[PDB]
Design a protein around this motif. Structure first.
Motif, PDB file in Angstrom:
ATOM      1  N   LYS A  26      -3.264  28.946  -3.920  1.00 57.00           N
ATOM      2  CA  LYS A  26      -3.023  27.800  -3.875  1.00 57.00           C
ATOM      3  C   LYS A  26      -4.424  26.909  -3.247  1.00 57.00           C
ATOM      4  O   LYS A  26      -5.266  27.715  -2.826  1.00 57.00           O
ATOM      5  N   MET A  27      -4.270  25.796  -3.517  1.00 57.80           N
ATOM      6  CA  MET A  27      -5.427  24.932  -3.271  1.00 57.80           C
ATOM      7  C   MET A  27      -5.932  25.225  -1.730  1.00 57.80           C
ATOM      8  O   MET A  27      -5.167  25.241  -1.074  1.00 57.80           O
ATOM      9  N   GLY A  28      -7.251  25.064  -1.742  1.00 56.63           N
ATOM     10  CA  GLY A  28      -7.829  25.664  -0.558  1.00 56.63           C
ATOM     11  C   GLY A  28      -8.568  27.196  -0.583  1.00 56.63           C
ATOM     12  O   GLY A  28      -9.369  27.263   0.130  1.00 56.63           O
ATOM     13  N   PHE A  84     -10.015  20.246   0.938  1.00 59.28           N
ATOM     14  CA  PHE A  84      -8.351  19.772   1.210  1.00 59.28           C
ATOM     15  C   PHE A  84      -7.736  20.817   0.353  1.00 59.28           C
ATOM     16  O   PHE A  84      -7.864  21.356  -0.477  1.00 59.28           O
ATOM     17  N   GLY A  85      -6.567  21.340   1.131  1.00 63.21           N
ATOM     18  CA  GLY A  85      -5.726  22.386   0.697  1.00 63.21           C
ATOM     19  C   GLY A  85      -4.734  22.687   1.674  1.00 63.21           C
ATOM     20  O   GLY A  85      -4.567  22.023   2.724  1.00 63.21           O
ATOM     21  N   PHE A  86      -4.057  23.738   1.555  1.00 59.26           N
ATOM     22  CA  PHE A  86      -3.116  24.337   2.271  1.00 59.26           C
ATOM     23  C   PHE A  86      -3.264  25.068   3.374  1.00 59.26           C
ATOM     24  O   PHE A  86      -4.282  25.884   3.305  1.00 59.26           O
ATOM     25  N   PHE A 101     -12.714  16.391  -2.148  1.00 58.78           N
ATOM     26  CA  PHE A 101     -11.702  17.001  -2.387  1.00 58.78           C
ATOM     27  C   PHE A 101     -11.714  18.354  -2.640  1.00 58.78           C
ATOM     28  O   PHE A 101     -10.875  19.430  -2.766  1.00 58.78           O
ATOM     29  N   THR A 102     -12.948  19.100  -2.438  1.00 63.67           N
ATOM     30  CA  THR A 102     -13.217  20.543  -2.506  1.00 63.67           C
ATOM     31  C   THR A 102     -12.737  21.027  -1.271  1.00 63.67           C
ATOM     32  O   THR A 102     -12.592  22.316  -0.700  1.00 63.67           O
ATOM     33  N   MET A 116      -0.835  20.728   4.993  1.00 67.32           N
ATOM     34  CA  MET A 116      -2.182  20.643   4.232  1.00 67.32           C
ATOM     35  C   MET A 116      -2.969  20.316   5.441  1.00 67.32           C
ATOM     36  O   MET A 116      -2.625  19.839   6.679  1.00 67.32           O
ATOM     37  N   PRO A 175      -6.221  16.733  -7.702  1.00 65.32           N
ATOM     38  CA  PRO A 175      -6.587  15.542  -6.451  1.00 65.32           C
ATOM     39  C   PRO A 175      -8.010  15.183  -6.684  1.00 65.32           C
ATOM     40  O   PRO A 175      -8.163  14.178  -6.219  1.00 65.32           O
ATOM     41  N   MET A 176      -8.826  15.864  -7.192  1.00 64.48           N
ATOM     42  CA  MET A 176     -10.224  15.422  -7.452  1.00 64.48           C
ATOM     43  C   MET A 176     -10.306  14.433  -8.410  1.00 64.48           C
ATOM     44  O   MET A 176     -11.324  13.803  -8.484  1.00 64.48           O
ATOM     45  N   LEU A 204     -12.417  27.009  -6.993  1.00 63.48           N
ATOM     46  CA  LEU A 204     -13.350  26.047  -7.136  1.00 63.48           C
ATOM     47  C   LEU A 204     -14.440  26.688  -8.066  1.00 63.48           C
ATOM     48  O   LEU A 204     -15.618  25.866  -8.099  1.00 63.48           O
TER      49      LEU A 204
END
Ligand SMILES: [Fe+3]
Ligand SMILES: [Fe+3]
Lengths: 174, 174
Positions: free
Chosen positions: B10-12, A164-166, A161-162, A108, B155-156, B17
């Motif tokens: 995946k997040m990112g 934050f990610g992989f 936290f927008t 991350m 996580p937000m 968003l």
């Protein structure tokens, strides 16, 4: 005996939330072994820095520094350093956002605001005094590793936290 | 022309968003295919639910439910549901904390506060009306998947980042 590289503890392990104890004696054989193990672990994982609690050692020991680092290809050379019992001074008001990762948060990255400049002091593994002013990425690494000694991991510092990610999504070329 | 299961973003990925658009036409071949792909992707990954933006489709479609789920083994049965253009009502003040994961955040869990009870309404893929009150884990999964439609990932929602980490450390048996 066969040597085994020390494993990095992952976020969720309660040991990463503890406050590390000070090192009472310098220049002991055991301390030299700890430092060697930390560099071995850090280098194998392409770390920018490492704090002793990340390998299960509850002591105020941090290492950092490289010429180039392929987890942080934009980072300039940072002086290779062993910093024991550190004291930091933050220099307000200038802050900088930057993408951070952590070997205890594998896979991350997130954006963290850090002081552009800090003072840090402490001791090397021989007991010699260190006293420096650091800026930019050098200052960021020192803040990130110092945070490990007071039980802080970088998601605790994130405010947005927008961002934050992989790593494989955020930084595919990496 | 071999079918390929849809991958979970995946997040990112910035698509997670975005705020999803409403479905304008019900009971179309295209909508039945989206729903089929979502169930295929969710089941293969042991999901408790899935929202269309997680497979790259920017529409207000969520699915959820199971008899049993091995990523949330303590969760009771949740009715299998397709919910399109959802309208949620939160019911203050009773909140409940619980460990959440997300297929878009593989390998992690974190504690999230949710409403103990919600009302939700919307339509199924045939255009029939749905209107329910949900409690506990049923309410939690509906809130979690609804969040995906408004660009929010769990996580937000976390406030205690000492209770966020890797599933293999937090829940070794899983
Ligand atoms: Fe770290
Ligand atoms: Fe999710």
């Amino acid at each position: 005996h066969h040597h085994m590289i020390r494993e990095i503890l992952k976020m969720g392990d309660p040991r990463l939330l503890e406050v590390a104890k000070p090192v009472a004696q310098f220049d002991t054989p055991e301390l030299h072994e700890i430092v060697a193990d930390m560099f071995e672990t850090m280098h194998h994982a392409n770390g920018a820095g490492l704090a002793a609690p990340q390998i299960g050692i509850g002591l105020q020991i941090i290492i950092f520094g490289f010429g180039s680092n392929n987890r942080y290809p934009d980072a300039p050379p940072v002086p290779e350093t062993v910093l024991i019992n550190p004291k930091l001074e933050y220099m307000p008001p200038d802050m900088e956002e930057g993408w951070e990762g952590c070997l205890s948060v594998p896979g991350m990255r997130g954006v963290v605001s850090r002081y552009a400049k800090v003072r840090y002091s402490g001791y090397d593994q021989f007991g010699a005094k260190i006293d420096r002013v650091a800026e930019g990425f050098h200052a960021r690494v020192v803040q990130h590793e110092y945070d490990h000694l007071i039980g802080k991991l970088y998601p605790m510092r994130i405010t947005d936290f927008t961002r934050f990610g992989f790593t494989e999504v955020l930084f595919p070329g990496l």
